[PDB]
């Protein structure tokens, strides 16, 4: 169970799935990984968003990225242990 | 450039050359921003290793109950950007 290669080994697994039996776990796994592929794509995007707006912009003093900083961590240690309660429709 | 999967290594790049006594507040500040990123994408990947050990690695399952895992635990992902999230809440 290494973190890094989890996807990996599910890709793997994937892979060995060929009877027809089992072809309908086989689509959702790839939806699975699809899926997955797209929420690391969209935590690449906050750091990109966060690098431009902030680190980037040679108009904002250093005291004023790190302001900057010290407040996007803080709200990203809050999401790391914020719990669902309810998703809305559209 | 922008491309995507090197933003990681992009804000490393930047941390690893903030070396003056002036910044140095700035490149604390970052190395945290790169902690706690990391810990999200350790905690995503192990949301899928706990999914391949607990649901694709136990024989007990049939075809179908794994096929119902799976597909809630994408949907669960899916319906995420539309999920109301408390930080800090009761137990
Ligand atoms: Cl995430
Ligand atoms: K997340």
């Given at each position: 169970?290494?973190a890094?290669?989890?996807?990996?080994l599910?890709e793997?697994?994937?892979?060995r799935?060929?009877?027809?039996q089992?072809?309908?776990?086989r689509?959702?796994?790839?939806r699975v990984?699809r899926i997955?592929?797209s929420?690391?794509?969209?935590?690449?995007?906050?750091?990109?968003?966060?690098y431009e707006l902030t680190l980037?912009?040679?108009?904002?003093?250093?005291?004023?990225?790190?302001?900057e900083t010290?407040q996007?961590?803080?709200?990203?240690?809050?999401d790391?242990?914020?719990?669902?309660?309810a998703?809305?429709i559209?």
């Amino acid at each position: 169970q290494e973190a890094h290669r989890a996807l990996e080994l599910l890709e793997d697994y994937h892979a060995r799935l060929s009877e027809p039996q089992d072809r309908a776990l086989r689509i959702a796994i790839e939806r699975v990984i699809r899926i997955f592929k797209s929420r690391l794509f969209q935590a690449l995007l906050d750091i990109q968003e966060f690098y431009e707006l902030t680190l980037l912009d040679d108009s904002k003093s250093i005291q004023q990225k790190t302001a900057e900083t010290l407040q996007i961590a803080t709200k990203w240690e809050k999401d790391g242990q914020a719990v669902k309660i309810a998703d809305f429709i559209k």
